[PDB]
Design a protein around this ligand. Sequence first.
Ligand SMILES: *[C@@H]1O[C@H](CO)[C@@H](O)[C@H](O)[C@H]1NC(C)=O
Lengths: 48, 49
Amino acid sequence: VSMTKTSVDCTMYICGDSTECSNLLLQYGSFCTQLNRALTGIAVEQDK
Amino acid sequence: CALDPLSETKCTLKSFTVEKGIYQTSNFRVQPTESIVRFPNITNLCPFG
Ligand SMILES: *[C@@H]1O[C@H](CO)[C@@H](O)[C@H](O)[C@H]1NC(C)=O
């Protein structure tokens, strides 16, 4: 009926404590935003 | 965006009237307080004695 209600932080996964990696990833667009949106939708779907 | 949590929610939602619910705005991280380095006792002492 339900699987693990997981969520992944795109920025922390792609880049660690380093900031320059975060800045360089920021130019790839809204990949991380929609990526987190998909997992949030999955989590709410599991609760539903 | 950085004024208050509701303002961060407004920035994340890109709206001025956030509806009733729970919204994830940012990620909390604990920056390390200090750095400690530990090494074992050195035995390769120069033969000064
Ligand atoms: C041998 O030399 C070291 C370094 O000066 C000294 O600390 C030690 O007391 C000496 N040994 C003796 C038996 O005095």
